[PDB]
Amino acid sequence: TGELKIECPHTIGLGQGLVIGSVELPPVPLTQVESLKLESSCNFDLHTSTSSQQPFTKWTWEMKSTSFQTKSSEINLRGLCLVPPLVIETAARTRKTIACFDLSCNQTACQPTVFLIGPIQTCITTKSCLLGLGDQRIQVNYEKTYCVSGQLVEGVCFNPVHTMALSYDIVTVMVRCFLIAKKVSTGDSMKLEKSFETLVQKTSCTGNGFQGYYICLVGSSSEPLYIPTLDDYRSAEVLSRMAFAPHGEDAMRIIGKVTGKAPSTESSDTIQGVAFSGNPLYTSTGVLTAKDDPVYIWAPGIIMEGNHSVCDKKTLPLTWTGFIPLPGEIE
Amino acid sequence: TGELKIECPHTIGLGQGLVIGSVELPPVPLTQVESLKLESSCNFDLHTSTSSQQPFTKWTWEMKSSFQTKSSEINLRGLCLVPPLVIETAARTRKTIACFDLSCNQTACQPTVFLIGPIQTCITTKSCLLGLGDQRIQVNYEKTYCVSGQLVEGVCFNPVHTMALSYDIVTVMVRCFLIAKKVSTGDSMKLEKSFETLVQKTSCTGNGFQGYYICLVGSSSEPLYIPTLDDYRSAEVLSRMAFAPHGEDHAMRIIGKVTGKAPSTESSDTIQGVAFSGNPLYTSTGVLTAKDDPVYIWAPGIIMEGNHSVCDKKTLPLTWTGFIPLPGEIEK
Amino acid sequence: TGELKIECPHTIGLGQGLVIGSVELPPVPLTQVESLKLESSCNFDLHTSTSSQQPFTKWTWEMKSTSFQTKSSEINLRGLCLVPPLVIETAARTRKTIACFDLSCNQTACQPTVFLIGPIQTCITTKSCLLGLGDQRIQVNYEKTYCVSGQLVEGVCFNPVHTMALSYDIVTVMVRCFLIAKKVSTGDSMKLEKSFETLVQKTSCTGNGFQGYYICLVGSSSEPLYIPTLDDYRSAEVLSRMAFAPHGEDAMRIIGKVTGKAPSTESSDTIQGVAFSGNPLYTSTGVLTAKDDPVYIWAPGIIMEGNHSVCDKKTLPLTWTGFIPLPGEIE
Amino acid sequence: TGELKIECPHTIGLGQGLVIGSVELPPVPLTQVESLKLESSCNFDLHTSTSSQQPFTKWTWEMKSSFQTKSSEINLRGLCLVPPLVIETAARTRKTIACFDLSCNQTACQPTVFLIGPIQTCITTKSCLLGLGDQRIQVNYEKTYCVSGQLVEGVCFNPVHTMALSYDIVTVMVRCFLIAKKVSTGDSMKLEKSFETLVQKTSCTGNGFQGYYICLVGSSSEPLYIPTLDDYRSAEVLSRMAFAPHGEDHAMRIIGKVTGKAPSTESSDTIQGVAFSGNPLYTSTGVLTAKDDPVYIWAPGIIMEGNHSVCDKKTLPLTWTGFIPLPGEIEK
Ligand SMILES: *[C@@H]1O[C@H](CO)[C@@H](O[C@@H]2O[C@H](CO)[C@@H](O[C@@H]3O[C@H](CO)[C@@H](O)[C@H](O[C@H]4O[C@H](CO)[C@@H](O)[C@H](O)[C@@H]4O)[C@@H]3O)[C@H](O)[C@H]2NC(C)=O)[C@H](O)[C@H]1NC(C)=O
Ligand SMILES: *[C@@H]1O[C@H](CO)[C@@H](O[C@@H]2O[C@H](CO)[C@@H](O[C@@H]3O[C@H](CO)[C@@H](O)[C@H](O[C@H]4O[C@H](CO)[C@@H](O)[C@H](O)[C@@H]4O)[C@@H]3O)[C@H](O)[C@H]2NC(C)=O)[C@H](O)[C@H]1NC(C)=O
Ligand SMILES: *[C@@H]1O[C@H](CO)[C@@H](O[C@@H]2O[C@H](CO)[C@@H](O[C@@H]3O[C@H](CO)[C@@H](O)[C@H](O)[C@@H]3O)[C@H](O)[C@H]2NC(C)=O)[C@H](O)[C@H]1NC(C)=O
Ligand SMILES: *[C@@H]1O[C@H](CO)[C@@H](O[C@@H]2O[C@H](CO)[C@@H](O[C@@H]3O[C@H](CO)[C@@H](O)[C@H](O)[C@@H]3O)[C@H](O)[C@H]2NC(C)=O)[C@H](O)[C@H]1NC(C)=O
Ligand SMILES: *[C@@H]1O[C@H](CO)[C@@H](O[C@@H]2O[C@H](CO)[C@@H](O)[C@H](O)[C@H]2NC(C)=O)[C@H](O)[C@H]1NC(C)=O
Ligand SMILES: *[C@@H]1O[C@H](CO)[C@@H](O[C@@H]2O[C@H](CO)[C@@H](O)[C@H](O)[C@H]2NC(C)=O)[C@H](O)[C@H]1NC(C)=O
Ligand SMILES: *[C@@H]1O[C@H](CO)[C@@H](O[C@@H]2O[C@H](CO)[C@@H](O)[C@H](O)[C@H]2NC(C)=O)[C@H](O)[C@H]1NC(C)=O
Ligand SMILES: *[C@@H]1O[C@H](CO)[C@@H](O[C@@H]2O[C@H](CO)[C@@H](O)[C@H](O)[C@H]2NC(C)=O)[C@H](O)[C@H]1NC(C)=O
């Protein structure tokens, strides 16, 4: 039994906050990954979006005798954290709970990371409940916070700044973000990879057309944070940490550079990365930055290219976990 | 001097809540019971209903050589016979209900005094005095030890806001008063039929009583109407009533089965019960379930039949005190 | 040097309060009493009313061989506590200070009691200052209170009830009252002795026509309290304590009953009392209750009749000091 | 890093008050003084007046064999030459004044930085940085230790509300700035005449300077105009100025009497003073009292003549820091 801890605040407050928790489970063989279904015994209202079938290009490597053979094909996965637009943003109002997983994989095995997001009211209704994923049971524990006004962060009770203007103590908090595909008809407002390129590039990249955004939750509970929100200091912070740690923040053995075709029907290579063996470390899921219409990739045993300074064959991860410093008061 | 504690909340809140408290006094001889009058020195607006004259059949037993029972019609005053709507609208009318029930053996009665009223009394009043016969009762209004809930067996507990459909479980006190209320057609007020259905008993016909219970939960709440089908608490109270028909706020020595005529003018027996001696334990007041028009009974030294599985000669108690489990949150 | 202590509150508050203090001085011979003038070096605005000439009937006794010879005459005194209507009541607004004395006398000597009443602002302007009376110097000391919300009473900090409605701790406080002559054209609203008679009499007195009232200060500082104010619990309390202790509340040797003519031009006796010797105990000043127009009396060596149960030949004292219980909070 | 403390009151109150603080920095060489610029990283609205170019006569002395003095006209920036109305209306305009005065010997100057501004700065700002040449200044806004007054030599003191006509006495700091202000006819602005009358000196004619002092009392106050006849504090400040014309915020070795030409184009001497060496003690800036149009002087290593009993060749200082006794109430 794994443990997914939810830190519950003393009050609901302004209505629009969500709780979030997550746990990384033990390794399962690859052949079992396509069968994985999240089950819930919990007394909450599961959003059905994530358990539908979702098309991915599977990209894999084998030793050959540069010394690699890669290949790819299109398959359907279910239960992954591909959250539709507005679902997280309006979950406090709809009273919907999002439960989904990401995959961190080597060639032969995957560690699912289960994410649970939902309304703060769940803390009134629920002390503990169970999720299942394949053969693993997950104990969700809702636990009331030691603090009076904030959250337990690095063993310290902390409340961040709230005002919209400019004016403190500084505490480093966890941020968890989910990639959302969202197109507009006209212009470049949703061209997410262009935002990264302005932050970390010298010269002009021609074709990074992916349209979407990240939706993030800060700490154990917060209102959703949209990335990018141009004049928000927290958005700026998350983007900068993403730009320097594109596979998130926290033995794996690097073998070499690999390329491949995504989707597999492409005549030439559209993706690159670094093949590895040993313990999976980063998530193995992302989207090509080059296509407006998302091309989703699952690349077990390969760290797909996420360096924003590169122009071609790069990706954005489906989920991203890191840390940002927040100004506020320790109490 | 007895002590009647009122637990006062920090705020009035949504306006319709009432405070309630109650105390059981020492035994008084039976001959003094017909003279008992509640006096008040308190700065609140007493509802006058309960101090009017109210006709009861008095049913008593004597050893013979075996039992001899007898009955007669008398008038009592001050008992908890609350008219319809009085408790339900007390928060709006600003009326205070003060009345007693009687728990009696053959020779003595312990009055239980009940005080119910608007939460505003907590602003106007720290302490005041009630008198009953020769006993003085100190009413003490005290702010609650809890932040938001109520002190329940030494624990601060806040119950869920009551929802129809959909953390901690605490057993809380419920106090209920029987209200006689007729409607012109149908069975919506046939309270004893509700009990019969629950105890799986469909053959009865002495179940024409029309009325309901009005209850307060803990030390303060809004009134709870029994039965209300879509309130989970109503279902709980009815079960608890069905299992403990004489309440559970509680040596008493059982002697045997007795019957009698209520009212005394009946040609055959209309009531049964169990004669006892020793310490009065349960209340000695109720109504026959068989008559649409209430026949009120005072039966000192007899536990009147309240088992809902029986069809004939049974009764409903005038007041009922018991306990139900509530879901909620225990403070800190 | 005598000491007149003023207890100063922390704030002025609602504007209309006055401070009061008083001290009883040592005995002076009678011949010196007619010369007594209050002098002040204090930085406050003295009301001039009390230092004007004021006609009194002097009533005195001598042993003779019932065994007494009494006599009387009309004389002018100055500086006594004969305060005009409205002066105390509006002193907080006018910023006037009242300084005057009453006399407590035996046949040969008088102890003046000096009263000082004035605006609470004096506590900002003044730490100490000097009054003189004949050959005595009086040190007025303004001292800031130990308490946060109330006054030091019996070594305890106390704040009385403030609301106009009915609802506590109970503390006994000093009350000091001054008799004010005030006539109306029509009716019995100002017939002060009639109020006493209703409280303490069996049958009907014919002729107690004095018109006036008492103005009182409670503790070391308060707003003026008018006696009688019919629906005020404090007025009721003061009147009852007056009725049971008509010469005030706190060795003197009683000799016998005496009568006399007030004013001295009366053909028959209009006043009675009890002759004494030894240490003066009560004040020796009052007014006849019988006359609408005040007949002021100074009766050294005689306790003038103040028993309200009597109908004829009785008086009201010019000043009155006693104690009443107040409901409130000790803190 | 130097420290400029601002004592912040609990409330803003009647709207027209300003906070003031000041700090004297370490010595800097003379050659660097003409390059000194105040920089600010603070979140307040700096008034631009004081950072403009301002013409001064520089008057200096050298040993000879006896003294050789000389003078020339130069432009300084950043000095406390505040225009009329700027301090007086700063609470309404929300402008902050930051400037320095100079206290100099022949070879080095200690700048004294003054910061004056609206009390609202206390809401917006806990700390910020000023720079002057190579020195950093930490401005620290700190809530007052007192309930209502100000910390004066380790004692909490609240002065009387100032009344014209009519408890404790505390000596408080006053800081004043000289303001040049002409009027078209009469002697209402002839500041040096006011001083002359007070020191009993009616024969003088080099007293045509027109202007006044604007002062702040303690760590915060409303501006005080000197002279204001019906303000008791004005009378006190003028006396204190007359007795200590170079202030009293304060080894210095006196060498002798010197004279010079201000401006340098004058054919005869128009200024005198006392040459010194060692630690600069007083400020080295002022204006000639003789000219209606201000002639500003910077005299490093010379205490310019400020004795009001003298008629000719005298000056008024640009800033003045001293102490006056105020009536009020010491807290607890
Ligand atoms: C992808 O990652 C997975 C998980 O990180 C990884 O598979 C695992 O590898 C470890 C070690 O290589 C396996 O560990 C074994 O566990 C059994 C359980 O009883 C042990 O008995 C074994 O012990 C023997 O082997 C050791 C060899 O050094 C000895 O030290 C020891 O004394 C014993 O002789 C053994 O350690 C584990 O079972 C798998 N896990 C899974 C889920 O299959 C995998 O290697 C990674 N893939 C690649 C291609 O890198
Ligand atoms: C009216 O009241 C006044 C004041 O209360 C009163 O006059 C005072 O009387 C006392 C005692 O009768 C006088 O006391 C005297 O004081 C001098 C001062 O030095 C003493 O030396 C005297 O001492 C001798 O007398 C005593 C007699 O018993 C002895 O015990 C003693 O050892 C000495 O021999 C003496 O006590 C006081 O001076 C006057 N005060 C004034 C102000 O005149 C007066 O008696 C009262 N009048 C009436 C008519 O009752
Ligand atoms: C009806 O109930 C009442 C009250 O419970 C009973 O009266 C009580 O009876 C008990 C037991 O007989 C008496 O006990 C005695 O107490 C005295 C104290 O004065 C003691 O000295 C004796 O040794 C004895 O234990 C008690 O006095 C009495 N109490 C009162 C308040 O009257 C009564 O017995 C019951 N009646 C029946 C018919 O069972
Ligand atoms: C003008 O004032 C400045 C500053 O007060 C004077 O400069 C200082 O002069 C003193 C005394 O001559 C110097 O003292 C020396 O300090 C050093 C420390 O490095 C010490 O090692 C020596 O033994 C000695 O005591 C000091 O350095 C110097 N300070 C600065 C900040 O420059 C200057 O003398 C004055 N000029 C005139 C003409 O009086
Ligand atoms: C991210 O991508 C850029 C571009 O490929 C890499 O930048 C080059 O790095 C090498 C060695 O650090 C330098 O010698 C080159 O001059 C860099 N080129 C440019 C255009 O910047 C960068 O190192 C990559 N970051 C990684 C792999 O972490
Ligand atoms: C309530 O009344 C019913 C009906 O009279 C009682 O049921 C009887 O119980 C005994 C013991 O279990 C059985 O031997 C009888 O056969 C039952 N009779 C019927 C008709 O059901 C029941 O005991 C009563 N409950 C009490 C006294 O608590
Ligand atoms: C106040 O005056 C009344 C009336 O003169 C006194 O009352 C009389 O007192 C005596 C003895 O106490 C009784 O025997 C009389 O019956 C009373 N008469 C009346 C009419 O009440 C009273 O004692 C006086 N109070 C004093 C001197 O303190
Ligand atoms: C201020 O200037 C006056 C006027 O020059 C000085 O007064 C002289 O003081 C000395 C010593 O007391 C006397 O011997 C002179 O006769 C005074 N002259 C005049 C004209 O009054 C005074 O000393 C100066 N004050 C200072 C330097 O503090």
Numbering used by the authors:
A (entry chain A), C (entry chain A): 27 to 91, 102 to 203, 209 to 291, 301 to 381
B (entry chain B), D (entry chain B): 27 to 91, 103 to 203, 209 to 292, 301 to 382
The study reports:
Hantaviruses, a geographically diverse group of zoonotic pathogens, initiate cell infection through the concerted action of Gn and Gc viral surface glycoproteins. The ∼1,150-amino-acid glycoprotein precursor is encoded by the M segment (Schmaljohn et al., 1987) and is co-translationally cleaved by the cellular signal peptidase complex at the conserved “WAASA” sequence (Löber et al., 2001) into two structural glycoprotein components, Gn (∼70 kDa) and Gc (∼55 kDa). Low resolution three-dimensional (3D) structures of Tula (TULV) and Hantaan virus spike complexes, derived by electron cryomicroscopy studies and combined with biochemical analysis, revealed that Gn and Gc form square-shaped oligomeric complexes on the virion envelope (Battisti et al., 2011, Hepojoki et al., 2010, Huiskonen et al., 2010). Here, we describe the high-resolution crystal structure of the antigenic ectodomain of Gn from Puumala hantavirus (PUUV), a causative agent of hemorrhagic fever with renal syndrome.
Combining established techniques in cryo-ET and sub-tomogram averaging (Huiskonen et al., 2014) with direct-detector technology (Bammes et al., 2012), we improved the resolution of the TULV Gn/Gc spike structure from 36 Å (Huiskonen et al., 2010) to 16 Å. The spike complexes extend 10 nm from the 6-nm-thick viral envelope, and the membrane-distal region of the spike consists of four lobes of globular density. Consistent with the previously reported TULV structure, we observed two types of stalks linking the membrane-distal globular lobes to the virion envelope: (1) an elongated peripheral stalk that links diagonally to the membrane and cross-links with neighboring spikes and (2) a central stalk located at the center of each tetrameric spike. Computational cross-correlation-based fitting of the PUUV Gn crystal structure to the segmented cryo-ET density localized it to the four membrane-distal lobes of the spike (see Experimental Procedures). As these two fittings differ in the orientation of the Gn, we used additional functional constraints to discern between these two possibilities. Analyses for both of these functional constraints support fit A, as summarized below. Indeed, in our preferred fitting of PUUV Gn tetramers (fit A), we observe that the C-terminal regions of the PUUV Gn protomers co-localize toward the center of the tetrameric spike and likely contribute to the central stalk density.
